[PDB]
C-alpha cells in the first residue's frame, strides 16, 4: 500500500513535468514570425500558486 501511494504521487509529478516540458518547449519554439503572437494583459504577474526554486 505504501509503495502504491508513492507510485501514485510520483506518477502525478512525472505527468506534470511532461506537460511542463511541452509548454516550455513551445515557448522556446515561439519566435518573431509566429502566427499566434498577441499582446497579453498583466503578463508580469505572479499567479496565486507560484512556488520558488
Amino acid at each position: 500500500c505504501l509503495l502504491q501511494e508513492a507510485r501514485q504521487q510520483l506518477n502525478a509529478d512525472h505527468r506534470g513535468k511532461m506537460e511542463t516540458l511541452d509548454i516550455d518547449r513551445g515557448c522556446l519554439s515561439l519566435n518573431l514570425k509566429s502566427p499566434n503572437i498577441s499582446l497579453k494583459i498583466n503578463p508580469t504577474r505572479v499567479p496565486s500558486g507560484s512556488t520558488t526554486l
Binding site: 499566434n36 498577441s38 499582446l39 497579453k40 494583459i41
Partner: protein, 99 residues
C-alpha cells in the same frame, strides 16, 4: 473543457491586442492639433482605406467573441456542478458498500 476555455481566452485576448494597438494609434491621432509639431503631408493613396471588418461588423465580431466566451464560462460552470454531484455520489455509494 480546460483546453477549450484557454483557446477561446486566446481568441478574446487577440481581439484585446488589436484593440490596444488601435487605441494607442488613435489617441495620438486625437492628441494632434493645428499648432502641433510632427505632422507631414503624406501623399494621397489607398493605404488609408483597407477592408477587413466595417464598424458594424467590427462590433459584430466583438459581440460574437464576447458571447462565445460567456457560453464557454456557462458550460464550464455546468461541468463543475456535474463534478460536484458525481464525486458526492461516488463517495456516498462506496462508503455504503464498505459498511
Amino acid at each position: 473543457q480546460i483546453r477549450l476555455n484557454r483557446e477561446h481566452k486566446e481568441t478574446c485576448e487577440m481581439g484585446w491586442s488589436d484593440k490596444v494597438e488601435a487605441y494607442n494609434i488613435d489617441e495620438a491621432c486625437c492628441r494632434y492639433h493645428n499648432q502641433s509639431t510632427d505632422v507631414q503631408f503624406y501623399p494621397h493613396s489607398a493605404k488609408f482605406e483597407e477592408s477587413a471588418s466595417t464598424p458594424e461588423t467590427w462590433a459584430k465580431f466583438t459581440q460574437d467573441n464576447l458571447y462565445g466566451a460567456e457560453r464557454e464560462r456557462l458550460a464550464s460552470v455546468n461541468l463543475r456542478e456535474l463534478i460536484e454531484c458525481i464525486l458526492q455520489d461516488t463517495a456516498e455509494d462506496l462508503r455504503l458498500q464498505c459498511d
